């Protein structure tokens, strides 16, 4: 009679396990953009001019 259910899935995160990684995570590329270029507002009309 003493039989019960298993396998309840949950995602728990703590600071301690993240700081105990023996090998630090290696990132191939940076996350954000360092500086966003600001084009002038006239590019919609300059594009029709070649020189």
């Amino acid at each position: 009679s003493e039989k019960e259910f298993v396998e309840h899935a949950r995602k728990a995160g703590l600071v301690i396990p993240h700081e105990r990684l023996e090998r630090p995570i290696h990132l191939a590329c940076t996350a954000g953009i360092f500086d966003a270029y600001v084009p002038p507002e006239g590019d919609a009309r300059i594009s029709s001019l070649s020189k």
Partner: protein, 206 residues
């Protein structure tokens, strides 16, 4: 502290006492035993921190640095070469920080790289006339130094500042032992002037 493990256990690049390991392997389960070819401690020539070349996989002929070695299952993990991509930050309404993860490799797919010619070469341990065990290559015949790697603590003894409860190097190495034939009990009693006159009676042991 040492954590006891079951007689049959599976290793998956996670330390036994981690929450990730407990989530993967609940204490009430046990899985199939994988076949691992026995390598004695004197035959394991792959350490952490030395450049190695990957033979088989999606990337072939590339070289990288070993960061982690799993001695139980005979695994060597290169630094971001045999990589698969996973997600780390997960919540209800947001996912991101796509971080590549490196899959394990066996010893047969990894051969040590000689410093000079930068090619894979078989390595055999040899005993030189200086009494030191130095790995020796087969083709080039050049010895390969040990891969000095920083410890897991992350503290370099070269750059260190003594705290309030840290003993100086001079006092640690200072010698004050005078080897006489009196126990620690006798020395302290006469050092502080504790004087005792009477003596114990006869006590029977059985």
């Amino acid at each position: 502290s040492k954590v006891t493990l079951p007689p049959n256990y599976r290793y998956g690049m996670s330390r036994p006492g981690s929450l990730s390991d407990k989530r993967k392997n609940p204490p009430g389960t046990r899985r199939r035993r994988v076949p691992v070819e026995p390598i004695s401690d004197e035959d394991w020539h792959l350490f952490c921190g030395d450049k190695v070349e990957i033979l088989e996989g999606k990337d072939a002929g590339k070289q990288g640095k070993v960061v982690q070695v799993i001695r139980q299952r005979n695994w060597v993990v290169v630094e971001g070469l045999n990589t698969h991509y996973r997600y780390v930050g997960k919540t209800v309404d947001y996912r991101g920080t796509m971080i590549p993860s490196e899959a394990p490799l066996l010893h047969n797919q990894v051969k040590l790289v000689d410093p000079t010619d930068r090619k894979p070469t078989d390595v055999e341990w040899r005993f030189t006339e200086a009494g030191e065990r130095v790995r020796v290559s087969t083709r080039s015949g050049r010895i390969i130094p040990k891969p000095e790697f920083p410890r897991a603590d992350g503290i370099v003894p070269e750059t260190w500042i003594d705290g309030p409860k840290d003993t100086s190097v001079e006092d640690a190495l200072e010698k004050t032992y005078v080897p006489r034939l009196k126990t620690l009990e006798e020395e302290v009693m006469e050092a502080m002037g504790i004087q005792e006159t009477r003596r114990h009676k006869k006590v029977y042991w059985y």
